[PDB]
Design a protein around this nucleic acid. Structure first.
Ligand SMILES: [Zn+2]
Ligand SMILES: [Zn+2]
Ligand SMILES: [Zn+2]
Length: 85
DNA sequence: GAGGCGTGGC
DNA sequence: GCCACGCCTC
């Protein structure tokens, strides 16, 4: 029901927080800044900043159960499993 | 690999 | 709102 009020946009979302995040695409707002040395990246929502920061810290939570290769994202690990079929 | 993004449990 | 999922596109 929550629909973007901008003229050229008709996107509708389920939750209010979803719409709030979408409006940042029109306004160009990005409150979530990466505080690394010289990165300067900014994001409209929380999770991609957290995901990005793992690029700096090498945090690879997702471990492969067959081989010792681990990845920072669940989707990366999923694709890797195809090489084990 | 990595950003952009729809969706949903808490 | 946090944060994960899974997908899309380059
Ligand atoms: Zn819009
Ligand atoms: Zn960064
Ligand atoms: Zn593996």
């Amino acid at each position: 029901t929550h629909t973007c009020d901008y003229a050229g946009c008709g996107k509708t979302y389920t939750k209010s927080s979803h719409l709030k995040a979408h409006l940042r695409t029109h306004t160009g707002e990005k409150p979530y800044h990466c505080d690394w040395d010289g990165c300067g990246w900014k994001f409209a929502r929380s999770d991609p900043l957290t995901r990005h920061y793992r690029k700096h810290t090498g945090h690879r939570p997702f471990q492969c159960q067959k081989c010792d290769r681990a990845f920072s994202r669940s989707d990366h690990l999923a694709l890797h499993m195809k090489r084990h079929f």
